[PDB]
Every structure is written in C-alpha cells, then in structure tokens.
Design a binder for this molecule. Structure first.
Ligand SMILES: *[C@@H]1O[C@H](CO[C@@H]2O[C@@H](C)[C@@H](O)[C@@H](O)[C@@H]2O)[C@@H](O[C@@H]2O[C@H](CO)[C@@H](O)[C@H](O)[C@H]2NC(C)=O)[C@H](O)[C@H]1NC(C)=O
Ligand SMILES: *[C@@H]1O[C@H](CO[C@@H]2O[C@@H](C)[C@@H](O)[C@@H](O)[C@@H]2O)[C@@H](O[C@@H]2O[C@H](CO)[C@@H](O)[C@H](O)[C@H]2NC(C)=O)[C@H](O)[C@H]1NC(C)=O
Ligand SMILES: *[C@@H]1O[C@H](CO)[C@@H](O)[C@H](O)[C@H]1NC(C)=O
Ligand SMILES: *[C@@H]1O[C@H](CO)[C@@H](O)[C@H](O)[C@H]1NC(C)=O
Ligand SMILES: *[C@@H]1O[C@H](CO)[C@@H](O)[C@H](O)[C@H]1NC(C)=O
Ligand SMILES: CCOP(=O)(O)N(C)C
Ligand SMILES: CCOP(=O)(O)N(C)C
Lengths: 533, 530
C-alpha cells in the first residue's frame, strides 16, 4: 500500500515524499513543497502570498522549477560553470522548498539547518546537485530545509515607495519559508526552537539581512555565512539607484510606451515575457564591472531600516552564535568574467596597464583618488610590473573588497557586541576541480565538502577528501546543535583583538590570526573616510 | 716664519696654522673673510664681496658663529652639546676655512666643500665634528667650509621687497663657492674639480645649488647626506614667508610698509630676534623651522620638486644616503611620551598625537592615512612597535622619502646616483640604545674623527672611518666611490640598489623603503589636491 514515514501533514494539507538511498543508509526527502502562491501574472514583483490549503495529498517527490534567471554562457559545456546553471526548467511558478529528514523520522525534536543558495541575487536554485541535503542528514541526523526564492528583476526590481514593486520580494520569499519552517518543521521531526540559517555568497548576504531585520530575527537561532556578507558593496543598493535601474530596464523593453506612474509602468512590465526581462537585465548597470549585479536587495527602510553597516554597528548581538569564513582565493573566479587579460584557458599573466584597468573594473564607481589608493596599496613597489604578482594582486583586490573584508568587519563587530563568533579559511583545492591552477581555491568550492558530496560513490573524490567532508559536516552540525563546532585540536572563537580563525584543509586544524588585517584596515577603516571627502 | 702657511688670495694676504694628525701635519687657514660683515643696514641683505685688505689677516683660529638659537633641552649632554655653538655668536660671521695637505700641493688637488646642517636655524663650520684635518691628510684633498647666516638673519623674507629679499643665507653659500673658484688654486686646489657635500639642511642647500643655474656652474659633483631640497621642511611659499616675517616683527615690538618694517627690525639686537624665532611657527611640531629658503622665482624659479621633475641631469654624479633611524632623534623634542631617558614606550593615544606633531599642517584625512599605513593591525597597541612606527613616520616623511624621490628622479633623468644607508651605531654614542643610529651620527666617521686618539673609537671603527673617507674621496675625484672587492652599484629607478655601510663588507640591497615612500611620494600629494 503506502509507507507511513513518507506521509506528513503540514498546516496547508497532506504531503507524500520519497525514501532516498544514501551510501550510509536511507533518508526521507520531501522535494518541491509549495510554500507560497505562484508569483505569476498580476503577482509578479509582488510580495509572496502564503500557500492556500489544499485537499488530497501533494506529491513532494522531486525538485520543482528553477526561478527564472539568466543562464551562464561563458564556457559552454564546461563543468566549472555548468554546475551552477539551472538543472530544472525555468518558471515563475518556483516558490517551493525541500525538507530532508532521517528515516525513520526522528522521535524527539532534531535541530534544523536551513540553506539559502547564492548566485549574486540573479541566479541559483535549491535543486543543484551540489546542494543535495541527503548526505548531511544521513551523516549527522539533522533536518535540512532549503527553499527557492525569486532572483533578478523578479525578485529584486524595486520602484521604492510603490506597492506594485516594493522591492526585496526575493528576501520575503525566504522569510515566508522561514515562517513555514517554524509552523511545520516539527511535523518532520525538527526542532523549531533550534534553527540554523546557512548560505553562501548572496545566500550568506541574505542570512545577514535576516539577522538585521527584526521580523526575520525571531525565526532562527544561529547563522553561518560562507563567502558573503550583507555589508558587501554588491549586496544592496540605494532607493534612487534601484529606481533608476528599474526605470531603465522598463525603458529597454518598450514599457511605458518614462517613469510616469508607478502602477502604470509596472503593469506594462507584467505583460512582458520573463525571458525578455532576463535578456535586458545586465544592460541597466551603470558601468563595466565584475562583481556587480543589477537587482539586489534595496535599502528602503522596511526590510532594512538602515544600511547593513549601520545596523551591524548599532546592533546588540548577545545570545547569537555565528560561523563565518572564506575560501582562500575569493577573487580569482570573477576575473575571467571581464577583467582584461584574464581567461581560464591560460595563465592570465597581466601587464601593469591591464592591472590598472582591472582595478577600475573590480572597484567600480569610485573616484580616481580612491582607485589610486587601491593601486598604491596593492602594488609591490620593488616589483611593480611583475605579471604573476599583478595577477595575484588584482585577485586580492576584488576578493578583499567584495568578500573577505566585508565579512571580517561583520565578524569583528558581532564579536565586540555580544555574539560568539567562529571563523575559518577554507584552503583545500578539490582533486576534481576543473578550473585552472592559478585560481587556487576559487569562490564557492567549499560547498560540496560541507554538503558531503564526496560521499557520492559515483564521484572520484579521494578517500581523504571523504574523511575531510565528514569532518566539516560534523563542524557544521555541531555548530547547529550547540553553537560551538568543537566536540564535547580546538577551534577558538573569533574576537576583535586576537582575530583567531582556523584553516580547513586535509591537515588538522591550525589557528592563525587576522583575516587579512592589513588589507581590511584599508577597506573597512580608511577608504570610507576618503569617499566622504 | 713658515712659507707654507702664507697665502695671498685676491683680497690680500693670509697667515695660517700647522695642525697635527696621527698621519702627519696639515695646513689650515681658518676664519678667512669672504664677505663684508652683514651688520647694521646690511642685515637681511645679500652678501657683499669682502673688500681687499692691507697687512696679513690672522687665519689661525675659527671665527664667530652666526647668530642662532642654542639648544637647552639636555644641558651638558654631549649628544646635544656637540651641535651647539662653540665660539661666540656674532652677526660678523661670514668667514670660511681651508684645510690642505702639508706642504701645500703643487699639482691641482680636488676640492671638497662642506655645508653644515642645523635646520637653517643653527650650525657652524667650527664644530669639532666638522674638523677637516683627517680627510685632508688621509685622502689628500682640499677641504673648504663656510659659515652662512641662519635663522631670520639668513632667511627672513618679505618677497618683492629690496629690504628683505630672502634666501640670503643661500647667497652666502654661493659667494663662498665663487670665492673658491677665484682663490682655491692659491692653496693647491683645483677649481675645476669641486664636490659639494652637506648634511641635513646642508644637503638641502646642496640640492638647491643644483637646481639654481647661477649656482650650478660653480661645482661639479654633489653629496647629500640625510637631506634633500624637496623635503617638506626645506622651503616655504611667498605668502607664508611674509606671514612669518610679519609675525616676527610684531613679537619684537615692530609695527607689522615693507621698508619701515625691516628698518624697525634692524634696530633690534640680534639676540632678540633669535628669542622669538620659534614662536612664529603655525603649529606645535617637530621638524619644522620658521625661516627656511623661500620659493620666490629668483634663486629657485619654481618649487624644488618641480625643477627635479623637469631637469636634465646627464653629466651629474650624486652620492646620497640616510642613517638607519632618521626619525628617532627628533621625537624627544615634542612627541608626547618620548625622552632619551625613558624607553619611550608610548601608548596608541600618544602615537596618534605624535602623528599630528611629526606630520604638521595636514588635513585629518591625511593623518588617518598615515595612521593606516604605519599601524600593524595585528598589534595595534604594542608600545615598542608604536615607538618604532612613529620614528618611521618622522624619518620617512622628512628625510628618507624626499631623498628617495630625488635619487629616483635624478637617476631616471641622466644622473649617475649612488645610494647608501648608514647602519653603524658608534661605540661612543651617548643617545639611548632605542634610538638606533640617529640623525647626524655618520658625519664623525666621514670626517675621520675616529682616528683622533684623544677619543675611544675601536680599532675597527678607525678602519671603518678610513673606508668611508676613501669612498667619499673616490667620488670627489672620479664620480665613482668604487676603488679604480665588493662593488657599489649605481642606484636606478627600477633596481633601486643601495649599499649598507657598517663594519661588514658592502651589502647590496633594494628599495629605500619603497613601500613607505610610495605613500609619501605618490599617493599623499594627490590626497592634498582633492
Ligand atoms: C496612477 O495610475 C493608477 C492607475 O490608474 C488606472 O490605470 C491607468 C492605466 C489609467 O487608465 C487610470 O485612469 C486608471 O484609473 C491610479 O490608480 C487608480 O486611481 C484611481 C483614483 O483613486 C482609483 O479609483 C483606482 O482604483 C486606482 N487603481 C489602482 C490603484 O489599481 C493612481 O491614482 C495613479 N497615481 C497617481 C496619480 O499618483
Ligand atoms: C590569455 O587569455 C586572454 C583571454 O583571451 C581568450 O582566451 C585565449 C585562450 C584566446 O583564445 C583568446 O583568443 C581569447 O580571447 C587574452 O586576452 C585577450 O587577448 C586578445 C588578443 O590576443 C584580445 O582580442 C581579447 O579581447 C583579450 N581578452 C580579454 C578578456 O582581455 C590574453 O592575451 C591571453 N594571454 C596569452 C595568450 O598570452
Ligand atoms: C570518475 O570515474 C570515472 C570512471 O571512469 C571517470 O571516467 C570520470 O572521470 C569520473 N566519473 C564521474 C561521474 O565524474
Ligand atoms: C614707507 O616708508 C617709506 C620710506 O621712507 C616712505 O617713503 C613711505 O611714505 C612709506 N609708505 C607708504 C607711502 O605707503
Ligand atoms: C673615553 O674617551 C673619553 C673622551 O670622549 C674620556 O672622557 C674617557 O675617560 C675615555 N674612557 C674611559 C673609560 O675613561
Ligand atoms: C555566483 C555568485 O555567488 P555569490 O553569491 N556572489 C559573489 C554574489
Ligand atoms: C638637525 C640636523 O639635520 P637637519 O639640519 N634637519 C633638522 C632638517
């Protein structure tokens, strides 16, 4: 007849899932659970509406559609970029979440990990093979939840102040899913009083925005931010710039036939095919750049009552445990997306002039004075034109500016203001990595080890990489359970003075000091004062 | 009487004195007048050539030191007293000294001309540490040194006025250079082989003579030790010069009309203007001086930095260098928390306060940039690192990076440049150990003072001194310090090679604090312009 472990009643109605095989045993998976009404037609750009109850049983047995998004075409067929591309059909009917739970379902409440994917707020989906939650659940006996949220114009196009495109609706998709977890995760055996958010890149920035937004802050208890932070120069935009990009996108697709009236302009935008909007999304950016995305969260006083930097500084974080970290070469992957002289298919040994040109691309919309401060800082004046040093230097520029230093400042302010902070640098380059060697450990390539993907026997990770994956899954699950990744070589907390972090590689833990303290002093302490004068 | 000590120069006859050195005798002619005494109505005016005299001028002892402030910070302490005047003050001070081998050379001998330092407010050619007898005996050159007016007497300027034109202490120097061309041959010197060298403000003066065409034709080579004309302290603009001259008049009871103002200033005793000199500076500071060369379009047709960037320097050889710890000396003169008696382990608040004293008259954003570059953000409050950092701030801003910029620009534009860092701390040094090798303490070795047996230098230090005198004299004779053994390579804008000078053989290194000097020479000028 039917398996009772694969049947669950949530508030909206009844669900049926699947028993998934893992190397270490079975898990229960509930894939493609609807948590909102489909944001289509007149509901495009609008905040999500809770899912209306249903009769009968909803088959939650496979991943649902990927939210409409740009699809990368830089290296067609190349595995390094195709692993991030959608592996389901694109659709605006895309607001579904997934729950993995042990089989049989836990008897006592189990801590919950909620995953938020990255993708620069223009791409991503919960269905990518690298986000498979079955290994974490099997190896560490937790409930894992992940959700889809709208991206690009559909998720973050803002006409601030209006009600037909209030902006930040992608973030409220995530908030609605977090509300779903609170009311429904106990039906799967999860503990709604022990919920850990974790995300990577734009997903990590999203996790931060949930810490800084009171309505979300009551929906979870711990946070993990990998290679991203809400105070990053890319993660938010101002109301005026949001309105300019939205208006310009509208103008490029023929609507209005030209700011005019907000409702009349959004109404014309809703008549355009989703693909049309996606095809003009990149044209709205003010300048040539890497690491800049058209539609991102807007600082509009609602979701974010101030900028994330202001709330990070004015924040009281007692009772909060946070885990933050970076990969070793955060900036290298992005240089092959527009920096002059860079390619994955050669060594990308650039000239001095290409370095100075790459600085303006990696640090866009700053004065010439600011740009020369960057060049001064990143130049080795005993070797000013060494191509190999120049390649590394520009990698450090975009990496420090966009990831490492925003995260270091978040870590320091939270530790100094009541939070327990743990920090890592991920330094293992996977044996299966398809990117060239000069890129080191690129952005986003720690995720597969945290989700335990090397345990998939149909993948050729070495045996030591599988023990490594098992090590980090324990760290993360220990953190989710207790707020401390150490087991009951130690991992010390991060503090504003000592600034201690650990390296995560095949070797045992190693404690170091300072997350590029010299470089981040420039980005977090000095250069803000330069832009204010 | 001895014929070797009788010399006739253009102005008349001179009698010198025979001196003893451990290597044998030298002849010396001290207190030779090269200008009319700049007294009374001649105060603040360009020097007038000395009128001819009858009889024989006594040139057997040093003459008066020009009127200057006397340091009273550590009274009786040798480390400061060795720089203080050692002859009576007087405005009648325009005299020069000639040292020569004994008996006087018969073949033309290369000439070294020494310009003393002292912030353009002090210094004298009679200091024990400038005694030319050892260089002249060891290396068989002719050595000349001159007094030049310092303080308001040499650099008070009301630009445009004929009463107080400015830069007259530089003109005193040039008149002595002219005197050398017309008279050094009467001592055996070769007027076609004149090497200028000076320390600190003396080095700044040398650089100014390079950049002033009427000066450039009076010498052939230059040595700049721990100074440069493009230093932030070395020149002043016309507006600030008039403001400082006006503030001085007011402080001495003189109505602050240019003719009346200088006339009133002329009536005041010299010591009165000395007493009020420091009080016209715009801010509390170390390393700033009230009356310095003014850029008025005459002696300097533009700022020293402009003329360095625009200059053709082919055919010029320069030797430039610094000591290891240029900044430590100056910290005990106004930096909070410092003393030659403490270990001067300052706090971060004292470090931040000291930044504004060692880098005066900069915007707050410029000060924050300095703090960014000189803080170690893994040890931001370590008192030993902070003491060391603000020493580097003062040294880099005021000495090392101006020297580095001049060396790089001169090398890239035709000059052959040799660069050194002096890294030997004298065994006899009285300053505390934490100050390292302080400003000014290479001069004793270059003048060969360790060979004086009346002093306690080691045997090693005596040999070291002889190696340095050989380098300096090789450079004077040929434009190359190397012996016609570890070689001293030219400094170039790209390789940036220099040598360390200590008891160990020569070691070639790269970069005169290239990271720090890109901040001061490349970035910060732009920050001031926006
Ligand atoms: C902006 O225009 C909207 C939309 O107006 C409607 O649609 C347009 C295409 C045009 O044909 C209008 O005449 C239509 O009324 C206005 O919203 C409407 O405003 C009226 C007046 O209060 C109200 O009765 C309708 O219900 C509104 N429709 C909505 C809210 O969907 C709006 O007033 C205009 N904004 C301004 C003038 O600031
Ligand atoms: C290293 O690669 C970059 C990128 O070039 C691309 O990839 C190469 C492997 C090759 O297939 C090129 O044709 C590709 O364009 C090179 O920079 C490019 O240089 C060409 C001129 O040769 C220029 O037209 C492109 O616009 C450049 N692209 C960028 C992004 O600047 C670089 O020259 C290569 N270095 C080598 C080959 O030594
Ligand atoms: C690892 O092993 C297979 C077996 O030949 C190899 O061809 C391939 O590189 C890897 N397999 C997969 C699925 O990536
Ligand atoms: C300035 O003094 C001179 C000197 O005698 C005098 O001729 C003149 O009257 C004074 N100033 C003027 C007229 O501005
Ligand atoms: C060292 O020489 C100095 C002269 O500077 C003299 O005062 C002193 O007595 C000598 N040393 C000793 C140990 O006396
Ligand atoms: C692919 C982008 O990942 P992340 O979220 N980032 C750099 C904005
Ligand atoms: C004080 C000795 O060096 P100099 O004269 N200087 C202060 C610029």
């Amino acid at each position: 007849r039917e398996d009772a472990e694969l049947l669950v009643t949530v508030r909206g109605g009844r669900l049926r899932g699947i028993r998934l095989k893992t190397p270490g045993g079975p898990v229960s998976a509930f894939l493609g659970i609807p948590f909102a009404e489909p944001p289509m037609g007149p509901r495009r750009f609008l905040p999500p509406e809770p899912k209306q109850p249903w009769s009968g049983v909803v088959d939650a047995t496979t991943f649902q559609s990927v939210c409409y998004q740009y699809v990368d075409t830089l290296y067609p067929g190349f595995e390094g970029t195709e692993m991030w591309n959608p592996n389901r059909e694109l659709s605006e009917d895309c607001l579904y979440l997934n729950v993995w739970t042990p089989y049989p379902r836990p008897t006592s409440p189990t801590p919950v990990l909620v995953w938020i994917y990255g993708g620069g707020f223009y791409s991503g989906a919960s269905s990518l093979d690298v986000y498979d939650g079955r290994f974490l659940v099997q190896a560490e006996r937790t409930v894992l939840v992940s959700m889809n949220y709208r991206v690009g114009a559909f998720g973050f196009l803002a006409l601030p102040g209006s009600r037909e495109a209030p902006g930040n609706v992608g973030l409220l998709d995530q908030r609605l899913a977090l509300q779903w977890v609170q009311e429904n995760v106990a039906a799967f055996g999860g503990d709604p009083t022990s919920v850990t958010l974790f995300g990577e890149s734009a997903g990590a920035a999203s996790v931060g925005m949930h810490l800084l937004s009171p309505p979300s802050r009551g929906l979870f208890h711990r946070a993990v931010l990998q290679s991203g932070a809400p105070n990053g120069p890319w993660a938010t935009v101002g109301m005026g710039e949001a309105r300019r990009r939205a208006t310009q996108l509208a103008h490029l697709v023929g609507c209005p036939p030209t700011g005019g009236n907000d409702t009349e302009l959004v109404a014309c935008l809703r008549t355009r095919p989703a693909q049309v909007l996606v095809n003009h999304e990149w044209h709205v950016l003010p300048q040539e750049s890497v690491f800049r995305f058209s539609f991102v969260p807007v600082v509009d006083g609602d979701f974010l009552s101030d900028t994330p930097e202001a709330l990070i500084n004015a924040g009281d974080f007692h009772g909060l445990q946070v885990l933050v970290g970076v990969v070793k070469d955060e900036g290298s992957y992005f240089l092959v997306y527009g920096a002059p002289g860079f390619s994955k298919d050669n060594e990308s040994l650039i000239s001095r002039a290409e370095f100075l040109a790459g600085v303006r691309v990696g640090v866009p919309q700053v004065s010439d004075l600011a740009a020369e401060a960057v060049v001064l800082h990143y130049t080795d004046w005993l070797h000013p034109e060494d191509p190999a040093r120049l390649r590394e230097a520009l990698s450090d520029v975009v990496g420090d500016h966009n990831v490492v230093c925003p995260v270091a400042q978040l870590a320091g302010r939270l530790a100094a203001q009541g939070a327990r902070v743990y920090a890592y640098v991920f330094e293992h380059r996977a044996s299966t990595l398809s990117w060239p060697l000069w890129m080191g450990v690129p952005h986003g390539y720690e995720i597969e080890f945290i989700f335990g993907i090397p345990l998939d026997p149909s993948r050729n990770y070495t045996a030591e990489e599988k023990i490594f994956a098992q090590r980090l899954m324990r760290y993360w699950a220990n953190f989710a359970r207790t707020g401390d990744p150490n087991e009951p070589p130690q991992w010390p907390p991060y503090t504003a003075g000592a600034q201690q972090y650990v390296s995560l590689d095949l070797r045992p833990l190693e404690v170091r000091r300072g997350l590029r303290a010299q470089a981040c002093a420039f980005w977090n302490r000095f250069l803000p004062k330069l832009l204010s004068a």
